[PDB]
Design a protein around this nucleic acid. Structure first.
Length: 33
RNA sequence: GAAAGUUCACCGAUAUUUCUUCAAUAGAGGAAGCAAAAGUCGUAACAAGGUAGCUGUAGGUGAACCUGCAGCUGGAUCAUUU
């Protein structure tokens, strides 16, 4: 332990998830227009 | 002198069409967020939390996450060849 009560995952992994979500969304939308 | 009417130019309602632009709206299907707290699968985090922890980046994975490379101490070290 080295940080205080961040609760809601590790703040690094939770960034990563939002990235591979955003990539996905872009890929969809681009074709759909 | 002077009416109806003629012809040309100008101003131009209105309609139509083109371009431009703003506002608002139906919707198959797809994807997130939050609030409820006695559902389900695990145990990642807080003690060296039982693979120290965290940051940046890439890859992998049912999920929390895991693994490589380079950093920080907000460590578990303020410190051992005169």
């Amino acid at each position: 332990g080295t940080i205080s009560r961040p609760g809601g995952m590790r703040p690094k992994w939770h960034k990563k998830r939002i990235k591979r979500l955003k990539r996905r969304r872009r890929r969809m939308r681009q074709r759909s227009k």
